[PDB]
Every structure is written in C-alpha cells, then in structure tokens.
Amino acid sequence: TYKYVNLREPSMDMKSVTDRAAQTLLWTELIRGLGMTLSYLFREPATINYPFEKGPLSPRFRGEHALRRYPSGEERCIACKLCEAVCPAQAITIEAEPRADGSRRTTRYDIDMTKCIYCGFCQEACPVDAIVEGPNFEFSTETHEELLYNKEKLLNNGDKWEAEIAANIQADYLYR
Amino acid sequence: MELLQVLKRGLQQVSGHGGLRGYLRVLFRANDVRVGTLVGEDKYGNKYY
C-alpha cells in the first residue's frame, strides 16, 4: 500500500557504469529535454483568439447579477429579504414598502458588486427565481461606484440578459 | 507530398474570404484568417462561424 520513490540502487557492472558516464559526457537526458521542447514546437498551440473566440462555459456560470420578470412584465422580486439574509458578504441591501396596488415590492435593491463574492447563494435562496447571477462576465468598469448596482441597473440587466438567463435556467433547473 | 495540400489550403483560405482584400481585412481585424461555415448573423453585423 506504499511505494518507495528514489530507493533504486544503480548497477555496478561495466555496462551500466559506462551508460551513466555516457549520459554524463554526452548530455543525453538534456537532449531528451530539448527533444520534448522541440516536440511542443511542432504542435498546435492551445491559444484561442479572444475577443473573437471565447472560452467554453456552462449554464451554471455565475457572472453578473440580474433581476428577472414574470412573462407579464411583473418583476419576480417580492421583498422577502432571503438573499440579503444569506449573502455571505452582505453585499445586498433591500428596502421595501407596499406600492400603489398593494404589492409587496422593493424600493431599494442594491448589490455592491465590489463586496460580492459571486457564490450564488442569492439565486439559490430566492424562492421565486428573481435574482439570478447570469452569464455576463465582461462588465469591467473604469470607476469604483459603477460597480455599485441599484435596482434600476439590475432590472436593466434582467431586461438585457433575459433571453439567455431563461434558457440557462431551463437547461439547469432540473438539477436544482 | 503533403506540403502541397498545406499550400493549397492556405491559398483557398485566401480565396475563401473574398480574395486578397477580404483576406487582409480579416487578417488585420482578427489576427486569424481561417474560414468557417457561416452559422449566422445578428441584427448588428456580427457574423458567427
């Protein structure tokens, strides 16, 4: 159940001693290393042509946050505050009140994307699939406060990315 | 000899982008000149191969 690495004794006949001296004087394993590097010279490299080629992803990928709507335009979020209760970074801040038709909705839904650890506990705690961590990873900003999303930015992320978010949830919800 | 087929594939990559003009266009915009099956095109002009 165990094996000894590096517990070989070299032979001491004239054959193997001359083999080790030929390896010393003729640099044979160094030529072996040159041969391996020369072998990789004549391979196709693994390099994709970004931005024109993209690395392969899965439908479970956890990128930029978005707030989804029902297929009637009504937003799914009903202010239950499970997502800021489970948020390990406390990146989510929610404030709510009943709006003009009596619906339980949020007035504040903020996600500090610089606090966020992108672990997706908010999408798996959400009982109505409102907050999702969608596919977008190319949302780098030139300013720190541009990574402090309010509810309007997250609803625009949902309206921007719903055509892809709904297909990823369709491909993945049976594992959940 | 199979170097000849390599040269023929390079020349028909030159032929496949619409000639030398489209070849240099994709060479300087993409840094890659290989041809592919046109899968689609969106409402902006992005072409997908």
């Binding site: 693994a46 970004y50 970074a89 500090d112 610089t114 992108y118 990873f137 190319e138 | -």
Partner: protein, 156 residues
C-alpha cells in the same frame, strides 16, 4: 490646422505604442494571482497582445493588484506604485482589490485598493475569470487609445 493634424497623428502613434506594448507588474496577493496565471497560460495567452509575463516593477506600464490588500502591505503597494515610471496604470482585479470584498468588514483589510493607489480599471469577480481579466486589460488598452496628451498640449 496643420499642427493639430500633426499632434493628432503623433498621439495616435504614441498611444498605439503604449497600448500595444503594455508591461504588467502583477501583485500576487491572493487567489486572483492564480487567475492572472491562467490569463498568462497558453489558452488566453497575454503575451500575444504584447502584454509580457512578469516584467520588473521599475519598467512596467500597469500595476495589476490581484488579491486582498491588507493593512500590513498597503505601504508596500504604494511604494511599488511610486517606483513605477510614468505612464503607469493600475488595474484592480477581483472584489477584495475593488472594495474589500469578502473581507470588507475586516479589521485588517484595506477596503479597496483605490484608498491607496489611483485605479484605472475595475475588474469584478471572485475571482474574475482569466477571460474577464483579459477583457479588463483590453478595456485599459482602449482607454490608452483615446488619450489626448499632445492634442491638449498643443491646445494649452
């Protein structure tokens, strides 16, 4: 005018040479260093963009802060930033460099590296993917592309 055209072409030339030859000094603070190393790995391959792998700080063009900036190392970050020659740029990478992240309420964490050094590009993630870091580096190159040093110099 003629001189406006000359300084516009000279700005285009020097902006081309400064964005197509970016040399990064990467702070390997925390887990974001692993994904920087994947951005240097053969798949994403920073070197084909002119972005060399592990240049020295006294000749680098961009400081990539990749990982948590603690209180014990914030003067070392500012000192290495001060040793960089101009034009120097700073890319913030991942949540702890951006705003403190998962250690935002910690006693021993600087809450964002922009309390220490001026930051040009904020790359978000935990960690951001190597493709996302490369997106941030290309957005830095586009920011260098629209600089107007000689045009404003001719207009001052």
């Amino acid at each position: 005018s003629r001189g406006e055209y000359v300084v516009a072409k000279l700005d285009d030339l020097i902006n081309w040479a400064r964005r197509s030859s970016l040399w990064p000094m990467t702070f390997g603070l925390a887990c974001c260093a692993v994904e920087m190393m994947h951005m240097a790995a053969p798949r994403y391959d920073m070197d084909r963009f002119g972005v060399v792998f592990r240049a020295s700080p006294r000749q680098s063009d961009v400081m990539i802060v990749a990982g948590t900036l603690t209180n014990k190392m914030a003067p070392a970050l500012r000192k290495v930033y001060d040793q960089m020659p101009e034009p120097r740029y700073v890319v913030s990478m991942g949540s702890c460099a951006n705003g403190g992240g998962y250690y935002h309420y910690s006693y021993s964490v600087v809450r964002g590296c922009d309390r220490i050094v001026p930051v040009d590009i904020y790359v978000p993630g935990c960690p951001p993917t190597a493709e996302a870091l490369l997106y941030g580096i290309l957005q830095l190159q586009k920011k260098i592309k629209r600089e107007k040093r000689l045009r404003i110099w001719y207009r001052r």
